[PDB]
Symmetry: C2
């Protein structure tokens, strides 16, 4: 039921890597003021991989605190161990998250039936709305549309973040589901299209630096206004591409630093955006009217 522009928020860090709580609080407020409809806390863009379990909990807790019930908060709780994903998802439920986002197990390459059992075990273990998340290029596995349609029958599985950027395939999924669960784009470049084709929203990277613009793109696309979606998305289309010059969230964190909103902290193995991309990113920010 969460719809619209859902930012996959970065986890602001001090130069030494520590979580920058003050900047995080200001970012959450800014998103709410600018039109963001929901926030995914500690997803891929939020460096879930390099935060400790305690930090994971604290970031979710702080975002929910600052949001103060004004928008729904989705907690990233994926893991490549079913046992761990249950533990993280239970923690998010106890913290009062509105839903959890669970990327498919990465690296260990479960079978389709293994993906089914993984998500079924978590759904039966924790009474919380769960959103699947498929991003094959990062995980080494591709949760098929057929498996997604099967999982939509499981109570508590309420949606899927489709980051394939394969629009025909996403439309096929939306059509097959016939409303049984939601479909969210996980690909900013094509999100406007998927939303015009029936997706419920965009779990976005670009929304981190253009939250108002993305809120508008999702609103007109969800309203099925093809021309307004095209026109408004065209203004920020180059941002969707440049925010991936190096692996996300490397560019988007640098962008937010050029905007003056967060410091340079980012945890190894990730690195600050390579020096050569900084001027081109600043130009893209200026071209889009962000700085």
């Amino acid at each position: 039921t969460i719809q619209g522009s859902i930012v996959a928020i970065v986890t602001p860090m001090l130069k030494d890597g520590g979580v920058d709580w003050k900047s995080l609080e200001k970012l959450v407020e800014w998103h709410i003021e600018q039109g963001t409809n929901s926030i995914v806390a500690v997803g891929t863009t939020g460096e879930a991989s390099t935060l400790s379990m305690e930090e994971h909990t604290q970031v979710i807790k702080e975002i929910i605190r600052v949001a103060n019930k004004r928008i729904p908060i989705i907690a990233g709780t994926g893991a490549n161990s079913t046992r761990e994903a249950i533990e993280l998802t239970k923690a998010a439920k106890d913290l009062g998250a509105d839903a959890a986002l669970l990327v498919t197990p990465y690296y260990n390459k479960p079978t389709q039936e293994g993906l089914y059992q993984h998500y079924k075990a978590i759904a039966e273990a924790v009474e919380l709305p769960l959103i699947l998340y498929n991003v094959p290029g990062r995980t080494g596995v591709d949760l098929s549309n057929d498996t997604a349609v099967r999982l939509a029958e499981i109570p508590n599985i309420v949606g899927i973040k489709d980051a394939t950027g394969d629009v025909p395939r996403g439309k096929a999924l939306i059509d097959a589901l016939n409303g049984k669960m939601a479909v969210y784009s996980g690909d900013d470049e094509t999100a406007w299209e998927l939303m015009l084709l029936g997706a419920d929203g965009n779990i976005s990277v670009t929304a981190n630096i253009a939250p108002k613009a993305m809120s508008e793109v999702c609103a007109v696309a969800i309203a099925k206004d093809e021309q307004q979606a095209k026109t408004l998305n065209n203004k920020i289309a180059n941002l969707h591409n440049i925010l991936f010059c190096e692996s996300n969230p490397i560019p988007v964190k640098w962008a937010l630093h050029e905007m003056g909103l967060i410091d340079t902290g980012i945890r190894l193995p990730l690195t600050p955006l390579a020096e050569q991309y900084r001027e081109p990113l600043r130009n893209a920010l200026k071209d889009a009217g962000i700085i």
Copy 2:
């Protein structure tokens, strides 16, 4: 300096998923008796992903205890967080492992420089021999030959497990290194060829079920006996293929169970080998004279 057949040993489990300590002991002994040259504890094939930190330590400790210095033990200590990789690698050094095997960070897709900094940071934090491990199909990142050659300059980085299965590229890496660090095959199907071309060994899945045969394949290939390497590898060639009919270690654990050496336990999201592949596997085992 470690050469030959290095088994990426499974972690035997009881039906409920608990570690099967007694079966692990018997396997370690069997490998020593059968000619295996080294064991990788808690690698990919050992389900590192679904073992807890305590279990990761217990398994390394137990394999070291049973091996009693007869063959070197390499501990899998890879993580997608540099801080966690440091901790796991320190623990392995403290437990007395001879070396550590560290897969490239998965899922978060660091840059080549990030991979460089990642491994440099670990090598500088822990004085223990480190073996890189590249398997892009699982991790979403490819540690290039260029980056590997840079890392060979770092004290404590003593080798790389190349699981690409791309022989020309493997040969190019061997030739570029010119002895600066070791190259191990991480692809059973092509390991015999890479060893004939200069690799120091094979960190093998097939060795789990044919330790004697793979130890002989490695020895003759390392001695550059092309005819004997081809002859001996032919006797187990179909095993290299069938052990990947579903994601490793699913098939190998089922093979060991058909051999009567471990029970069926395997942790979600992994699943017991699908029934459709069991007769073909049993037939391949009978063909190879294993059962």
